[PDB]
Amino acid sequence: IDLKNFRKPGEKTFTQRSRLFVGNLPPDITEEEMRKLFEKYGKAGEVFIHKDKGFGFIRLETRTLAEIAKVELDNMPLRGKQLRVRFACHSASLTVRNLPQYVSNELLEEAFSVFGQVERAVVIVDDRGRPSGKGIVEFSGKPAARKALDRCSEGSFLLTTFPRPVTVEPMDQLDDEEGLPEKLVIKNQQFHKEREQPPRFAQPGSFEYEYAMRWKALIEMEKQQQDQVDRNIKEAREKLEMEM
């Protein structure tokens, strides 16, 4: 299995999306040895090593090059330690909501580029191709993300002729890939209290069944409350959009 032109010329290189966290490093890990571990992926960008704690950061060229380095070097033995290679979180990512119509990735990137250099901008799209009203804007550095978050909350940032300001907020970063493995679970007393009963269906008649059926009725109660608010919001937004 060989490759070479592992690049997409349209998008930038050495962004935060290609920065890898490397844990469980040997005590005397050097910056040159760290680069030599990743030298097969071409030249690396920013490399930091905290030699005491045994962790480090390395910035590869492209995102797909880092995904190859992750699955190849994760859990790899190196002088008595199993290396932990994960993708670092993005330090300057923003969530954009209330997007108007006819907004693309390029327009979203062009719009927020006035606050600083932008690495990536996405208009989140459903399974059928239409936008969901939400988007992602990733800046190269924290100051550009701080400026975009402050100005868009104070003033009204308009992307199109439609004078509805977009809402900017920090990206709620959720890990739906690594999750919570069994070895990372806290094995305490409340652990074994819940783990006493295996996964099962509640037997009709027991205390579990009656208590769970009240939860199902309560969850259905929550759905009726939320869906009532959703219809109230739509009628309120159609009221403002009606007047001129």
Ligand X SMILES: *CC(=O)N1CCN(S(=O)(=O)c2ccc(OC)cc2)[C@@H](C(=O)NCc2ccc(OC)cc2)C1
Summarize as ranges the residues that interact with ligand X (CB under 6 A).
21, 23, 48, 53, 55, 57, 86, 88-89, 91, 127, 173
The CA distance from 88 to 95, in Å, is: 18
Between 88 and 149, name the residue whose CB sits nearer to ligand X: 88
In sequence order, what are the residues at sequence separation of 6 or more whose Cβ sits closer than 8 angstroms to the Cβ of residue 168? 94, 95, 96, 97, 137, 148, 149, 152, 153, 157
The CA distance from 68 to 77, in Å, is: 17
x-marked contacts with a copy of itself along 69-108 as a string, rule CB under 8 A: -xxx----------------x--------x-xxxxxxxx-
Report the candidate in 176, 186, 181, 183 with the shortest Cα–Cα distance to residue 87: 176
Between 114 and 141, name the residue whose CB sits nearer to a copy of itself: 114
x-marked contacts with a copy of itself along 29-48 as a string, rule CB under 8 A: -----------xx-------
Between 30 and 104, name the residue whose CB sits nearer to a copy of itself: 104
Give the bridge partners for 58, in sequence order.
Answer: 20, 47
Ranges within 217-236 binding a copy of itself (CB under 8 A): 218-219, 221-222, 225-226, 229, 232-233, 236
Between 103 and 145, name the residue whose CB sits nearer to a copy of itself: 103
Decide if residue 142 touches a copy of itself (CB under 8 A): no
- We find the least distance from the C-beta atom of residue 46 to ligand X, in angstroms, to be 7
Give the bridge partners for 86, in sequence order.
Answer: 21
The CA distance from 191 to 171, in Å, is: 31
